[model samples]
Target chain A: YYSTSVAKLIEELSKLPGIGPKTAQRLAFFIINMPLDEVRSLSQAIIEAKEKLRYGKICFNITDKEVCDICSDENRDHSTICVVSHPMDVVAMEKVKEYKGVYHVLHGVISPIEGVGPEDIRIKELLERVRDGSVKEVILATNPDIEGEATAMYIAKLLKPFGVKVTRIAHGIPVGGDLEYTDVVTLSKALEGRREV
Target chain B: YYSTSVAKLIEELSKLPGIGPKTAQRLAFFIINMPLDEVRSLSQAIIEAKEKLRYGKICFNITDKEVCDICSDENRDHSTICVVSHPMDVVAMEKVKEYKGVYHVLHGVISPIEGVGPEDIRIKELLERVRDGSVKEVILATNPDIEGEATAMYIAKLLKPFGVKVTRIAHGIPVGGDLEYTDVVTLSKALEGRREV
Candidate 1:
C-alpha cells in the first residue's frame, strides 16, 4: 500500500501556487526527509497565515508578532495611510525605503462579479480609519484593473466627506518598453507629457 | 447530477500549473461564458501544443511542407551550433532574440543516476552533424546543474578529436542576487574571477 500520509501531504501541497502534481510529489518527498522542527515551522506558518491573519490583523512584517510592525512603529508616519490590496504589495512598497507610512491590507479587492463586495472586505475598518481626524492623506495604490479601480472609487466617495485628500496612483507608459514600439494611446500620452529641463 | 462536460473541464484545468481547485472552478466558469470562436482557438492551441507540436520527428525547426523555419532562414548562422538539454531551454533562449545560429537540441542530458546515457539522446546525430564539416564551434548551453556539467564535459571530450572549438556558456553570479547569497561552489567561482570593477 502507498504511504497515505505522503499522499495527503502531496495533495495539500498541490493546492498551493506554482506546484503541480509532480512538484507536489517532489516537495512532499523532500519535506518528509526534512528536520521535524523545520517541517513544524512551515506547517505552523501556513496554518497561522490561514487562520491568524484575519480582519484588522496586518501581516506585512517578517516578525512573528500578531500586529504588523508598520502599525506599531512610532517613528513611521501614520497620518498618510497607503492602502494596498495584498500583503505582498506592502513588501514591494517597503522596498522603496522612502514611504514612511502605515497601511490597510484588504485581503482582496471588491468585485461584484467575483461575489466580493464592500462588506466582504475590511471596508468598515477603513471607513473607521478615514473618519478619525488623525489621518490627512490616503494613497490608493490599488492595481489599475476594473475591480481595483471600482474599489478605489467606492472607498474614495466614502472618505470624501471626511475631508481627507484621496489620490490614486498615476497610470502611464510602462517602464522597459520601447517608445517607438508603444501603442498609439500610450505614445500620445508620453508625447503630451514631455517635460523640459 | 452535475454536468459530465463541466466536471471533465474542471478536472483538466485543475491539472495545469499554478492552478488550484478554486482557480480551476473559476477558469471553467470563465471558459463557459467565453465566445465559441475564442474557446475553440484556446482548445486548438492546447491540443496543438500537447498533440501536434509535441512528439514525432523531434527537431527545433521540423516542417511538414518544407524545411524547418530555422533551417530555411537565410540570415541564421549555420556554422556555430548550440546544443541544449531540453526544448524548454530553446524557448527560454529564444526570448533573448540575440541567438541567430541554428540549434541541435539534445532533448536530455547524460544522467547516470537516472540511467540516461549519451546513446539514449541525439549524440550520434550531433557527431554526424559535426563530422559533416558544416559546424565550426559547438556551444553547449546545458543547465548549470550537476547533470548539465557532466553532459558538457562528455560532449567536449567526444568532439575534442575533431578539432572543433567547444565552449560552455559563462557561469557566474545570477542577476538580482548578492555574493553572500550564492552557495559555496558558485561563491568560489565568483571569488576566482574577482576584478577591479
Candidate 2:
C-alpha cells in the first residue's frame, strides 16, 4: 500500500527459497536503506553468478570454467575420487582440509520412495569417469541416511566391474557425541567396525 | 574449489544479516541455477529499491516521494495522529487497516542507557505539528518496553501544554493467548486494565 519499489522488492525476495513474506518485507526495507554502492554490488553478485556460473564438466560441481578447481588441481590425488550426494558435501569435506583427492557430485541420492533411482542423478557420468582406468579408488561419502546408503551400495556394485576399489566412509557416533544419545543403528555399526587397539 | 563466480556470490550473500556462510553457499548455488531473467530481475529490484526509496519527509516512514502515502492521503483523519517509535511499526499498523488516522514516526524511543533523548528522535517535529492545533488527539503507540514507556511519558507531558488529548495504547494479554503462559507483568496489566461487563 506504499512504495512501488518496496512492493516489487518484497515480491522478488519472497520467491527465493526459505524466504517467507515477512522475511522478504524486512529484507526489502533493509535493502532500501543500504548504501547505493553496496546494493549495487549485491545485485551485481547475484546477476554475475547466474550469468557466469555453471556445472563442472568433469565433477558436476559448480564452476565458472570447463572443470572445477579441485578436479584441475595438479597437487590433488586424481587417482582417488570422493563421491558425494551434493556439491555442499564437497564444501564440507574441503573445509576439513584432510582430503586432497578429487570429487564427483551425484546431485542427489537414490530415493526409491520418492521415485528417484540411479539414473536420476549423475551416476552415468560417475561410471564413465571410473571406467577410464585412471581412478584407483572411489570413496562413497554420501550421507548416513537410507537413501544415501542405497545409492552408495548401487554405485559400489557398478564400480566393481571396472576393478576399482570401492569404500564407504566409516559410520559411528560423532566424535563429540555421547553414546547415550547415539542411535541403535549407529551404535551397532560402530561396534561391528571395531578393531584391536 | 568450484567456480570463482559462485565463490564470489556466496561471499557477498554471507554479508547479509542472518545469512550464515552455509546458507549463503546454498543461496548462491540456487541463484546460479535460477533463470537468467529471474536472477536479473531480483538484482534489478534490489538496486531500484535502494535508489528510489528514502525516508518520508512528513512522517519519517519509507517512501519514494516527499511525504508518505498515508500522510498524503486527503481522506485520512488528520485531526488524530498515532506516534510510533519506528517506520516498521507504521507498516505493522497499516497491515491491520483499522487505524484511519495519520502517523508521526519517532524513528526511535528515548533510551537513557544508550544516551538517546527526545532531541535524537523526531519528537520536535511531532510537537510542532501538534502546536499548529489541527491535531486534537495524539496516541502514543511506542513499544511496551522500558525505553518506549519512558519515551511515551516524555512526549505525553510535552503535548499537555499544546491542549491535545495524549493517550497511550492499552496493555493486556494478547487475544487468544493462554493466561497460564502469559508473563506475570502482562497478567497484572490485564487485571489493572479490567473493564466492566
Candidate with top DockQ is 1
Q: What TM-score should be assigned to candidate 2?
A: 0.49
Candidate 1 on A1-197: residue-level lDDT in tens? 23998889888889888999989988888898899999999889978887764444542333346677777788988787777777666766665456667887676788787668887777788877767667877777666567667888778888877877676554333332332333444333332332210
Candidate 2 chain B minimal-lDDT segment of 10 residues: B188-197
State how far residue A143 of model 2 sits from its true place (Å): 47
Per-residue lDDT tens digits for candidate 2, residues A80-167, read 8888877677776675556768899888888877668878899999999978778877877666567666787678878878877786
Candidate 1 docking classification:
incorrect
Top-scoring candidate (TM-score): 2
Q: Which portions of model 1 show Cα errors greater than 4 Å?
A: A1-197, B1-3, B54-66, B194-197
Per-residue CA lDDT of candidate 2, range B54-153, in tens?
8887878888899898888889998888888777767666654567888899988899888887799999999888887488778777766777778888
Where does candidate 1 clash, by residue pair? Answer: none
> How well is each residue in B1-197 modelled by candidate 1, as lDDT tens digits?
34889988899988888999888888898998999999999989977866655322324433443445665676888787777766555555565556677777787889999999989888777888888847777877666577777887898889988867786654433333332233445433332222211
All DockQ scores:
0.01, 0.01
- Measured over the true interface residues after superposition, the C-alpha RMSD of each candidate is 17.8, 28.8
